[PDB]
Swiss-Prot record, chain B:
Name of the protein: Na(+)/H(+) antiporter NhaA
UniProt cross-references to NCBIfam families, sorted A to Z: NhaA, PRK09560.1, PRK09561.1
Topological domains, Cytoplasmic: 72-87, 122-145, 192-195, 228-244, 302-330, 372-379
Assembly notes: Monomer. Homodimer. Under routine stress conditions, the monomeric form is fully functional. However, the dimeric form is much more efficient in conferring growth resistance under extreme stress conditions.
Phenotype when changing residue 124 to C: Decreases both Na(+)/H(+) and Li(+)/H(+) antiporter activities. Increases Km for Na(+) and Li(+). 5-fold decrease in Li(+) binding affinity. Changes the H(+)/Li(+) stoichiometry to 4
UniProt site positions, description: Essential for cation binding and translocation: 154-155
InterPro entries per record: Na/H_antiporter_dom_sf, NhaA
Residue spans crossing the bilayer: 3-22, 50-71, 88-107, 114-121, 146-167, 172-191, 196-213, 215-227, 245-263, 278-301, 331-341, 349-371
Function: Na(+)/H(+) antiporter that extrudes sodium in exchange for external protons. Plays an important role in the regulation of intracellular pH, cellular Na(+) content and cell volume. Catalyzes the exchange of 2 H(+) per Na(+). This stoichiometry applies at both neutral and alkaline pH values. In addition, can also transport lithium and is involved in lithium detoxification. Binding of the Li(+) and H(+) ligands to NhaA is coupled and antagonistic.
UniProt similarity note: Belongs to the NhaA Na(+)/H(+) (TC 2.A.33) antiporter family.
Effect in UniProt of substituting residue 216 to A: Loss of antiporter activity. Abolishes ability to grow at alkaline pH
Outcome when changing residue 243 to C: Increases drastically the Km for Na(+). The pH profile of the activity is shifted by one pH unit toward the alkaline range
Record field: catalytic activity: Na(+)(in) + 2 H(+)(out) = Na(+)(out) + 2 H(+)(in); Li(+)(in) + 2 H(+)(out) = Li(+)(out) + 2 H(+)(in)
Amino acid sequence: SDASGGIILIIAAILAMIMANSGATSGWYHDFLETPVQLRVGSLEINKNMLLWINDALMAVFFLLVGLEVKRELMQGSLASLRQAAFPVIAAIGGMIVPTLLYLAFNYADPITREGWAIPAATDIAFALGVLALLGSRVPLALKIFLMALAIIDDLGAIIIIALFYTNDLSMASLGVAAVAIAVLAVLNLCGARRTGVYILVGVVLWTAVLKSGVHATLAGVIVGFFIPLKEKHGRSPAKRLEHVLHPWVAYLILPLFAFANAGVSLGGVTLDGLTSILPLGIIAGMLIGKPLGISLFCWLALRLKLAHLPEGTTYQQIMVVGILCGIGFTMSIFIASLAFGSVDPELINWAKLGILVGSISSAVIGYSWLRVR
Amino acid sequence: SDASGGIILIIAAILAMIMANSGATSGWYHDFLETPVQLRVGSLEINKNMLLWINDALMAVFFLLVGLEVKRELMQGSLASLRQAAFPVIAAIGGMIVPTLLYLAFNYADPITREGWAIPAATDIAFALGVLALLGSRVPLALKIFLMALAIIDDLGAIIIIALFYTNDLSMASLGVAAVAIAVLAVLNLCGARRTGVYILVGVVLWTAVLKSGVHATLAGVIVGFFIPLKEKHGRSPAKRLEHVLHPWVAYLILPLFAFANAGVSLGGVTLDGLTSILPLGIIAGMLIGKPLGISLFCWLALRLKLAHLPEGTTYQQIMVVGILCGIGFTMSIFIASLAFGSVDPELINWAKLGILVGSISSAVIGYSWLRVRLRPSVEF
């Protein structure tokens, strides 16, 4: 059903552009998005934008799904054996190094915009598999597995690194409750409980605990995902089931809603044709050249260094085209930018949005054409 | 599994007495329970206690289940055919008039305390089916059906009436969003979507909408339940499945938690032996005498007026004892009181807590004893 998810996501995003551009609505849009939301429990005060609660919740859910999927892969999929997994793993850590270094060389010594290094290293899984299904039955399953693997390794990678990078903000209290929640998840797993709702509840406790950090509130859902039992011991599996239940939500609701909230950027406000500012052009360079070159190069080096490829997908032609398709960070990149530029500046977020819009919509159209003939 | 639900409920409530009495903890308990919680969306300012967000959530869920159940009954159970349902229904509207009138005649003309009329008219379904399950295989299923139907008709009844009674507080915006949400549930049913999470979501939107009224945020879950598709048309059913998923939660988590939060009352603070104040004794009389007499009398009158009884349960002996067992309002009576007195007084709530604690723990024990000697004994050899 990843065909309809793509079109509903693109309808949502385009509708968001229309929302944030046309004058009659583009005021309501922003006054809604930038509206202060704050909760007070006695002396406890948490305050964020509408956009920050929306983002933290939606990405919590999304990365709950990603957690489930990456576990499934790590134990029962393309990421289980050290043999099969080598090719996507190498293709990923090479598909992040090149985009980052091509954006950092393009962003030499700017302590503000340095921090957005993990922006080109994103890949909107939904939009990648969204354009990949537009080709239809001509598309092999090794390809869809490979791409859906790359997206996750890279995105979870970026989230993890950025999580380890900004720690200056988390209180000892929140860290304590976080630790005890994660502990409860662990003990609950090793004592083996089928009932998945409990894992979700404890999970929400963890989320609430680490709420003052978008990357940690996101990483919460991943922790929860990792800690839901997989084994078919029950006769049925709870993680597989929950993933199955999630997939249509996060595809028809969560992602299109996030896109509707975070992909809107004003062009009717300002569109200076000089998209050469180090964020737009550094990002575009990091995505349109960084992704395919990284993937392809590290795949040459992969093949040389004894490590073979994923069966019946032409390694020279199709793999590199997928490498281009990874150059559409669309939604995921928007989030990363909304993590690296949310606290620093309202206008760096928008030029990043523009830069990744250009870098995404182009690489999806460009990547499409080189693939419709293969 | 209502045998372990009962004991976990009583362990919860007893632990709540312990919590609310011993000096070393009963302060933390109250500063936790009365802690202000408020949410601000630009100009939107919504504030309650800990206890009110807790109560509204828990009762929303509980009555989501109750809604599902009362629907299933209303179309496929003992409330479906106008024939069968006659006996429980008649047994109910009398088991509510008598408690109320026994409490209002005992609370004549005190505008503060009048409003707590529907307090004896409650029955803690979990506690009743809890004590009833202590008697074991001696207990016929017609009896548990009967009681679980009585509790529901009386409680949903009181919640409906009380919902109609206080309307003064609802802003027009909240009612607008409410109505449009309800309408979404309707159209969603009539276009038939098996996916049940959607109904739940729109339900939450409705809940948030009417949140400034515990009775309406409670009745919201009942609306949601009433609007989830029932037919086995899918091959499977969404309502039955959901209800089945709820049954453990609402019995192991929701109810015991609610008890732990709302059943705690101080005795080591004050226990003036004169529980003769019109609330304690009014409620006591409304539950201990109002419930059994109402049920039994309306059942005499039911049997006379052509309307028979539910099969193989001794209508004279057991029905009336179930009538007493309806007289344990514990958890539900606490909620109704916490609705009728919360805004007006924090100490009328506590004397109601006392009065219904007395009225409950007495009729539970009294009702037990007249029932252990009306069941036929499972012999062993």
